[PDB]
Amino acid sequence: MLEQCPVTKIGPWGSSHEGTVQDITESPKRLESITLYHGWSVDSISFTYLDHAGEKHKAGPWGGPGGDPIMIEFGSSEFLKEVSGTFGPYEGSTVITSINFITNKQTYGPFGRQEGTPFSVPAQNNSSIVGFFGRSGKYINAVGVYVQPI
Amino acid sequence: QCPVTKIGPWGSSHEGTVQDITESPKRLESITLYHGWSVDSISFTYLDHAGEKHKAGPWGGPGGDPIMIEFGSSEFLKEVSGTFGPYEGSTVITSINFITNKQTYGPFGRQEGTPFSVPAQNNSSIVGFFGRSGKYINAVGVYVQPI
């Protein structure tokens, strides 16, 4: 139905310009899973999506090698409604310090440490977050979203 | 057809009453706002997907210096950003800023508090607003239309 609609790219949030640019080269239509490595920090993000041609891809990891993973598997009627968190300085760079994933079914997080400036990306009504882009190094410097009608 | 993406709002989750538009927005024609201690009020005119034009607002209250923005025929709004914070017991939108594909308007208001931003990429366009308001503008979000 709405899976054919074009996606909207919005963001990123966090560091204005630090880190290696990370993005995807197909248009995401469905978010299948996220793997986030975390502890006291938000270490890396990965995610699997279906594109608008129905092909599956895994992006990431974007970030460094620390932390322990959580894998969030989207249920068949589960969609991502909001990403939120905090960002702030660490060792001379601005990093995402905490992150939180709010679906229509559950909240996963917060992961990392709730310190610095808050950010939030809420998709309303007929909108869901289907993929990410951003900048990273040892941690995640900035993150943005792709948003699709559902 | 395809619903327009709706993102936000940022600011108070509970103050004011909900403000929103009733049609699917396709093109943003103009914005009027007033600014002083905060973004006191906002209105905007948009074209919907049936070709009707609508003026939304004013959302907010009296006071402040007026600003009127009329978009060029091939000008579109790429980013809205601002701040929210406390004013006389309320959480309000303290400042707002607009970046089009041709120029920047703002910032308007007092850049105090928590920042927010909607940088619309890939030639998408911010085509309308929603939020919460009463005496002040307590929260704001946007509608984004992809190319």
Author numbering:
A (entry chain B): 157 to 306
B (entry chain A): 160 to 306
From the reporting publication:
A protein involved in resistance against different pathogen groups, which is only present in monocot plants, is referred to as monocot chimeric jacalin (MCJ). Therefore, the development of disease resistant plants is mandatory. It was shown that the rice (Oryza sativa) protein OsJAC1 enhances resistance against different bacterial and fungal plant pathogens in rice, barley, and wheat.
The JRL domain has a β-prism-I fold composed of three four-stranded antiparallel β-sheets. Two of these sheets are canonical Greek key motifs, whereas in the third case the very N- and C-terminal segments of the protein join to form the outer and inner pair of strands, respectively. The two dimeric assemblies of OsJAC1-JRL superpose with a root-mean-square (RMS) distance of 0.87 Å for Cα atoms and 1.24 Å for all non-hydrogen atoms (using residue range 160–306 in all subunits). The dimer itself features C2 symmetry with constituent chains being more similar in crystal form 1 of the OsJAC1-JRL domain (Cα RMS distance 0.58 Å) than in JRL-cf2 (Cα RMS distance 1.13 Å). As indicated by PISA analysis, the extensive interface involving both hydrophobic and polar interactions buries more than 800 Å2 of solvent-accessible surface area on either protomer and is classified as stable in solution. In contrast to all other mJRLs from plants, the two chains of the non-crystallographic dimer of OsJAC1-JRL are linked via a symmetric disulfide bond formed by a cysteine residue close to the N-terminus (Cys161). The possibility of disulfide bond formation for the JRL domain was already indicated in our previous work based on a shift in the thermal melting point upon oxidation. Overall, the intimate interaction between subunits suggests a physiologically relevant mode of dimerization; accordingly, the disulfide bond may not just represent an artefact of crystallization under non-reducing conditions but may actually occur in the full-length protein (see Discussion section). The increased hemagglutination activity of the OsJAC1-JRL domain under oxidizing conditions points to a crucial role of the intermolecular disulfide bond that is consistently observed in both crystal forms. Intriguingly, the hemagglutination activity of the separated JRL domain decreased up to 8-fold under reducing assay conditions (4 mM DTT). These observations suggest that, in contrast to full-length OsJAC1 and the DIR domain, the JRL domain relies on dimerization via the inter-subunit disulfide bond to achieve optimal hemagglutination activity.
